[PDB]
Amino acid sequence: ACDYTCGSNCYSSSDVSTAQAAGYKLHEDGETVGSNSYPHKYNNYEGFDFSVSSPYYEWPILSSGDVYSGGSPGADRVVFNENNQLAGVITHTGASGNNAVECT
Ligand SMILES: Nc1nc2c(ncn2[C@@H]2O[C@H](CO)[C@@H](O)[C@H]2OP(=O)(O)O)c(=O)[nH]1
Numbered sequence: 001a002c003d004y005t006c007g008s009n010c011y012s013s014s015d016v017s018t019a020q021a022a023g024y025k026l027h028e029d030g031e032t033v034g035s036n037s038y039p040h041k042y043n044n045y046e047g048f049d050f051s052v053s054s055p056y057y058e059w060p061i062l063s064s065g066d067v068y069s070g071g072s073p074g075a076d077r078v079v080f081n082e083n084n085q086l087a088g089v090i091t092h093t094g095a096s097g098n099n100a101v102e103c104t
C-alpha cells in the first residue's frame, strides 16, 4: 500500500524522507536546482491544514525513485518547513492549472 498516493504515483514514507532530506540540504545552503529553482517557497494558497509551522518550501518527489537533480520535476512535491519537518505531500495532478491537491 502507498503511504502517499499522488494521482497514479505511489510513495512510501521512505521515498518522502529521502526527497525531503535532499530538498532541505539545498535550502540550508541557500542553493537551488532546476530551471524552476527548487526548493522554493510554498505559499499554501490552498490553505491546507498543515500541523507544522510555516514558512513552507517545496521540492519535487519523483515516481522513478530518483532524487530530483534538475530537469523535469513532474507533478509531485514534498513540502517541508524551516525545522526540516514534513508538512505534507502535494500534487498538481487532478488539480486545475497551477493548483494543487494533497496526496492521499
Ligand atoms: N498551487 C500552488 N503552487 C504554489 C504555491 N506556492 C508556490 N507555488 C508554485 O507557484 C507556481 C505558480 O503558482 C505553481 O505552479 C507552484 O510551483 P511548483 O510547480 O514548483 O509546484 C502554493 O501555495 N500553491
Ligand SMILES: [Ca+2]
Pocket: 010, 011, 012, 015, 065
Ligand atoms: Ca518507492
